[PDB]
RNA sequence: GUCGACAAAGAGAUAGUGCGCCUAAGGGCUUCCAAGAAAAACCUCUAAACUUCAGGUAAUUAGUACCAGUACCGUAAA
RNA sequence: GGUUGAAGGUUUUUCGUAAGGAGGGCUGGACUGGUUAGAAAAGAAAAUGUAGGCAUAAGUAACGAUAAUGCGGGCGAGAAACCCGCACACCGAAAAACUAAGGUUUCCACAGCUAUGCUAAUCAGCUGUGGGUUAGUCUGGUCCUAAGGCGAACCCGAAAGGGACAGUCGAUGGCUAACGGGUUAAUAUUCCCGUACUACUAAUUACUGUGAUGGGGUGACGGAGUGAUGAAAGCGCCGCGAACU
RNA sequence: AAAUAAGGGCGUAUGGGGAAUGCCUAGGCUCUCAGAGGCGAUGAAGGACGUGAUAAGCUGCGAAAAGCUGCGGGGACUGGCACACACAGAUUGAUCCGCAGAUAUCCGAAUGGGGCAACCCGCUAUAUUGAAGAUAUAGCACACCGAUAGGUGGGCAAACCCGCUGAACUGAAACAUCUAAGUAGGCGGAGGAGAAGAAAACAAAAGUGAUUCCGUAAGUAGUGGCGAGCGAACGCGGAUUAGCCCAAACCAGUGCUACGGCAGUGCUGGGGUUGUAACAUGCAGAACCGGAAGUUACUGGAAAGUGACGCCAAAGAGGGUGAUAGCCCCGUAUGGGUAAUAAAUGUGGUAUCCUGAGUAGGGCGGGACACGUGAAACCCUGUCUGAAUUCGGCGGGACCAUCCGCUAAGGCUAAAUACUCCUGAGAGACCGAUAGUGAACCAGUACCGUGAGGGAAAGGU
C-alpha cells in the first residue's frame, strides 16, 4: 500500500516540531488500512492519519500530458517514537 | 518446486517492493536488479499456476 | 536479417575515399546495415570535461567492405558449407 | 536567531468583574382569505421469534469514527 | 545524350506565316530525350471564381470610461509604468470581506524577456523549473422525499416502441455532534493551543419483556401587522496602561 | 574620400521576401488471381487509468503490466520510436520469427443495487483485534428449457441477400392519372453466399422436361391523360447439373374416454409417397536452409560512368550502396525442411379404401404481374360466403364445347450468381504534396457549436 515516503521542505519542517510524517499511499486505500499498514510495517503505533488527494498537471506544450495523480497520507506517530526512513 | 517450498517462495521473494522503495528514496547501486526481480516474481507466479 | 560479416573480423574497404584501409569490425548496426571498422572514417566532433575537437570512428556501408582471404591478399565473397562454416569462393580455404 | 535589514521567546497588562443611550436577531400573539408540500428521523403499541438466553435501562473504563471537496478568481485581467 | 555536368531558373543569338525550334554564358547538381505511330486529367485574362504570398490606402485611424500623478533611493547594460519611502487623488450598501454557479492550477518561490501584455520593461494571471489543498462536528454519499425519470407484472401498437401499479432513483427541501485564537511564501471550524459535544463497540455492577416491513402522535409549514423585554454592532463620559512634547 | 536634382523615370548588377517549377518518395487510386467473411457472459467493439534504471508523448502490455511459459527456426548481439551520460543480460547459446498456453485493473450488453461511463453502496459464506470504523476470496441480473446438477440468448460490426414499411424534388416544357420508385430512408434475421428450386409447368398437332446466371429474341408483342414514358414472353446458343423425404388408407404394441369386446381420440414401430396415376505409411502444410559469376587505366569528393580484356545465366524481375551495377549486398530461377492439421491406399389383378377443408372458387376493396378495369386470364388477401374425390380437380389471357398438359391447399436440397471490414501474391500508356483518401507529417487531430455535427494547414540539410 505504501509506495514511497514524502521528503519535502513543508513535511520536513514539521516532522521535527510535531511527529507528523508523510507517505505516498495507494489511490484506493482508506485511513483504516493506512494506519494498519504503517503499524505493521514500522511498528511505531500510528495515530491520526490524514489523507489528501492530488490532481494531475495536465500540461500542454508544442503535445499534452498528465502527471499521475496520487494520494498522500500524513501520519501522526506517538510521542517518543520516530520513523527511520 | 513441490508446491510447498514454492508457494511461500513466491511470497518471500517479493523484495521487489522493498528495493523499489529504497530506489525511490535514493538511487541504488545497480538499479537493473529491479527488473530482474520483477520478472523473476512473474516466472514464479507462472510456474505456480502451472503447478 | 542475416549478415556475413560479424564483429571481430579483419576486413578491407573496397569503395570510398579510403579504398584499401584495413581494420577490424567493432560494432554492427544490422537494421541500417552499417559496420564500424577501426581505423576507417576518422571524423571530427566539436564537443563542448574540457575537450575540443575529438576524433571518432564513423560508420560505413557493409557493401563497401569485403573480407580478406587466408590465401594471397585479395577481397573475396563468402559462402556457407555444412557446423555452417563460411569459406571464401576464391580459394576454398576457409 | 536568519541573511546592518529583519526578527520570534518574554514584560508593561488579571491594563473597571465600568457605567448610560441604543439594540428582534428570532419566537410568540393579532388579523385576513387566496386556506398555505411529502417522507425519513424521534416516542408508544403489538404481530412471528425466545425465555433463567439474546435484546432493553442507568453509572465507570477502554477502543473506534468511513468515502469525495478544501489552493486561487468569483460586482472579475481567472 | 549526361557528374568532361541532366532537368529546372536567368540573360543572349538565330530560324519559321504563327503556335514554337535550335545554340551560347551564369546558377543548378541527376536524369533526359530525337524519328514514326498511339492515348489524353492536353493550353486562362476576366466566372462580385478558390488557396497561399505580397502591396495601396499609411506610418494614417487607434492604443479600449477625463479617478492623477510628483520626487528620492534599489537591482539593472538599459526605468514615465518594476521594488522601497515620502507626498497627491479615487471607491468606500463600493472599486471592501466570505462564498455559490462556473473556471480546473490561473495559487507560492526562483531563473527569462524569445512569443503573449494594443508601448518599453529588470514586471506579470506569460515561459521553465521546485512546491502547495490535512475534517467524527463545514458541503455532498453512506439517511428521507417533491416535480420528474426508469419500471418486473399488466394494457396497447406494422417494427422500433407507447402507457403505467408495486417498486426504484431524483434537491432546489427535511434529519444530523464545535467554538475562540496562533503559525507557513502558499492549508486551515481541517494543523497546534484552550475548552466542549455526538454516535457505535467491548468489559463490570444494579437490572428487566425486548420486540417491525403493521397501527398511532409529532415532524408539518400562508400573507400582513406587532407589543413588552432585549443580544451582537454603534455612540457619549469617567477611570487605568503605554508612547511623545 | 567622392558624388549630389529636394525627389522622380528608364536600363544593368547585387540583396531581402516568398513559395511556384524541376527531381524524389514515407502515402494514396483502380484492379487481377486464390482464400476468408465475424467478435462476445471462459465477459466483445470502443475507451479510462496504470506499467520504464531514466519517461513528456507515440507503440506494446495489464498489479505476473516495453512483459511470463512450452515446442520448432536461428547463431552475436540485445534492453521499442530514442539518441547521450550510463547500468546490465547473452555461445551454458541470448535478442528476434512461427504456433500453441498463463495473467489480463476499471467503464462499457455490464449482468448484486444504484448512478452524473470509468464511480458510490451492499447480502450470504469463511479468515483477519472481529467488535465497532473497515478489509482478503467465492457466490449473488433477466428470458427460455432441464424434472433435477446445468445449458441457450442478450451487445457490436463493411458490402451482398431476405421480409415488413416507405417519400419528395424531378419529367410530363403547367398539373391532379402516370413517372421519379418500390428508389432514398427506417426496422428485424441468417449465411459465405442468400433467395429460388423439382410442374395443379410450357408449347401447339411437332415437341421439351427442376432452379439460377450470360447473349440474342427485342426496343418486338403489348401497355400508356394511347401523353411523358414503361416494356415482356416463346424459341435458340452456353456455364453448372441432383434429386429426394412426410400426412392419409393399412398392420402391431400401448394410454384415455355385457361379463366376448367394440368405437373414438393420443404415442412408438412398420408400410407408403404418384399423372405412361393401401388390398497406418508417404505428397501438400509456419517460420526457415542454400542459391552462379570483374579486374584494370582516366575523369571525378565519391564509379556503379567511359575504354580494354573475362565469366554466370532454368538466375539480365526489383531494391540499396558517396553518380547510372547480371558478376558489392539483399535478392531472383531451380532445389530442400517444416508443428498442428492433411493426402491415395418382384410380377399381375375384381371390388373396396386413401391422396393435404373454412381449402379451391365467388361477392366487395386493394397489390404484384410489361398489363393504369380494360375483352382482363394467372398469383396474395382485409371482410363475408363457400364445393367434389380420380367417369375428380386445375391450366392452355373474358367465356363455352372438344383436344393437350399437369395433379394445389406439406417440407428439404450443392454448382453455375452478387459484395469486400479483411487476407497472400502481383499489375497499371494511375497520382506525385493546392495532385492522390478529409488525413504521405502525433488526422477525424487542432479549431467551431449546448448538441447532432463541420473540419483544416503542415514532406525534402
UniProtKB/Swiss-Prot annotation, chain B:
GO molecular function: structural constituent of ribosome
First and last residue of the signal peptide: none
Any one GO BP annotation for this protein: translation
GO cellular component: ribonucleoprotein complex; ribosome
Domain of life where this protein originates: Bacteria
Record's keyword terms, sorted: Ribonucleoprotein, Ribosomal protein
Family: Belongs to the universal ribosomal protein uL29 family.
The protein, known as: Large ribosomal subunit protein uL29
This protein's encoding gene: rpmC
Amino acid at each position: 500500500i505504501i509506495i514511497r515516503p514524502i521528503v519535502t521542505e513543508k513535511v520536513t519542517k514539521e516532522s521535527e516540531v510535531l511527529n507528523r510524517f508523510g507517505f505516498v499511499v495507494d489511490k484506493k486505500a482508506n485511513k483504516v488500512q493506512i494506519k494498519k499498514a504503517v503499524e505493521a510495517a514500522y511498528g511505531v503505533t500510528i495515530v491520526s492519519v490524514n489523507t489528501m488527494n492530488v490532481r494531475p498537471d495536465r500540461s500542454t506544450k508544442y503535445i499534452s500530458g498528465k502527471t499521475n495523480a496520487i494520494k498522500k497520507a500524513i501520519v501522526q506517530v506517538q510521542e517518543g517514537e520516530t520513523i527511520d526512513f | 518446486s513441490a508446491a510447498e517450498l514454492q508457494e511461500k517462495l513466491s511470497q518471500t521473494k517479493k523484495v521487489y517492493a522493498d528495493l523499489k522503495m529504497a530506489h525511490a528514496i535514493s538511487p541504488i547501486a545497480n538499479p537493473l536488479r529491479i527488473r530482474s526481480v520483477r520478472r523473476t516474481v512473474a516466472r514464479l507466479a507462472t510456474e505456480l499456476t502451472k503447478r | 536479417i542475416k549478415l556475413k560479416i560479424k564483429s571481430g573480423d579483419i576486413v578491407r574497404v573496397i569503395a570510398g575515399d579510403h579504398k584499401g584501409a584495413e581494420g577490424k569490425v567493432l560494432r554492427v548496426y544490422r537494421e541500417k546495415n552499417k559496420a564500424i571498422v577501426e581505423g576507417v572514417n576518422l571524423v571530427s566532433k566539436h564537443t563542448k570535461p574540457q575537450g575540443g575537437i575529438v576524433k571518432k570512428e564513423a560508420s560505413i556501408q557493409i557493401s563497401n567492405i569485403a573480407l580478406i582471404d587466408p590465401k594471397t591478399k585479395e577481397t573475396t565473397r563468402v559462402g556457407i558449407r555444412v557446423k555452417k562454416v563460411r569459406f571464401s569462393k576464391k580459394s576454398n580455404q576457409v
